[PDB]
Design a protein around this ligand. Structure first.
Ligand SMILES: Cc1ccc(C(=O)Nc2ccon2)cc1-c1cnc2c(c1)[nH]c(=O)n2C(C)(C)C
Length: 330
């Protein structure tokens, strides 16, 4: 039924969680120990979940996403609770997931990694991306800071499908008509940073970002230019002077030739010609880890709520229904 909640203030806010979650420490997200399972968990308290319609919709969206995903390389909902015992008093939402311990930015420390650690880290990203994309969901903001990694170099993806600031890993079509391969471009930027130890495109603005991107992959041809309707976007690409496409063998010299070939297939300007997650998993670069019978897909995700403009109270009760109906995973 109902458990005992205790209150404790951290990060200048008051946390109220069941007694089964002990030793809360901030990392708004806290690290905590679940005395029921013996697991170290990550606890997230949603900030002002129903302050506005946008906040209420995003609160509902985040809860719907976590309840759907059941994948090894995708963060999932272990528990969700609220101290309120009625809908009217409902104004707090807590999310409990696995605690990996660090992000990809922390464990990398801006250092070069072996080709095999790169193989393993990138394989988990694509393996989880395939599951996410099979549910018809785009991450849109894949970056090292939302890739949770433990001391075993195991990886889970965070914050997928949440976003609708520096954008070093955003596909060049989001800045400046796009599909799921916008996440594949982010994987290429991440994989390039793991191999060489520097940010591939350290842009200072959206135009400086574009200049660094075009300098590597080259100025587009007519078959790509004819698919851009934005007269401003077509201007920036062409008004930026002619730039020959770099040799990826020279940009990533010393790296595994199979790694360079995969990067050329990921960092394609034309998103219509960009490799997908499933095709990337079948690339020869992942020969040591690829198994088609262990790269499962997801059930269909009901996304129709995204196209609805509802009041705050409606998004709140829908969120409330999802909290009461939650069943913990095995
Ligand atoms: C608690 C929580 C709740 C929801 C979401 C989430 O991803 N929300 C989504 C997903 C799709 O849409 N919205 C993420 C977390 C979470 C945050 N940080 C975590 C973590 C889990 N596990 C970790 O190890 N860490 C760090 C090491 C501290 C990085």
């Amino acid at each position: 039924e109902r458990p005992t909640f205790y209150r404790q203030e951290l990060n200048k806010t008051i946390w109220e969680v069941p007694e089964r979650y002990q030793n809360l420490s901030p990392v708004s997200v806290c690290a905590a120990f679940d005395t029921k399972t013996g697991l170290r968990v990550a606890v997230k308290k949603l900030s002002r979940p129903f302050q506005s319609i946008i906040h209420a919709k995003r609160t509902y969206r985040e809860l719907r996403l976590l309840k759907h995903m059941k994948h090894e390389n995708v963060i999932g909902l272990l528990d969700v609770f609220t101290p309120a015992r009625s809908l009217e008093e409902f104004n707090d939402v807590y999310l409990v997931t696995h605690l990996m311990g660090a992000d990809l930015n922390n464990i990398v420390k801006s250092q070069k990694l072996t080709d095999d650690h790169v193989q393993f880290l990138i394989y988990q990203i694509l393996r989880g991306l395939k599951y996410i994309h099979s549910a018809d969901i785009i991450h849109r903001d894949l970056k090292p800071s939302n890739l949770a990694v433990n001391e075993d170099s195991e990886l889970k993806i965070l914050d997928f499908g949440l976003a609708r600031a520096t954008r070093w890993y955003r596909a060049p079509e989001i800045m400046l008509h796009y599909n799921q391969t916008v996440d594949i471009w982010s994987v290429g930027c991440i994989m390039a940073e793991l191999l060489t130890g520097r940010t591939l495109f350290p842009g200072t603005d959206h135009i400086d970002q574009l200049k660094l991107i075009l300098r590597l992959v080259g100025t587009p041809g007519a078959e790509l230019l004819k698919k851009i309707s934005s007269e401003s976007a077509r201007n920036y690409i062409q008004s930026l002077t002619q730039m020959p496409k770099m040799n990826f063998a020279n940009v990533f010299i010393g790296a595994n030739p199979l790694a360079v070939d995969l990067l050329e297939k990921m960092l394609v300007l034309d998103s219509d010609k960009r490799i997908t997650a499933a095709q990337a998993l079948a690339h020869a670069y992942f020969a040591q880890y690829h198994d088609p019978d262990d790269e499962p897909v997801a059930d269909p995700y009901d996304q129709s709520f995204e196209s609805r403009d509802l009041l705050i109270d409606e998004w709140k009760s829908l969120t409330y229904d999802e909290v009461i109906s939650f069943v913990p995973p095995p």
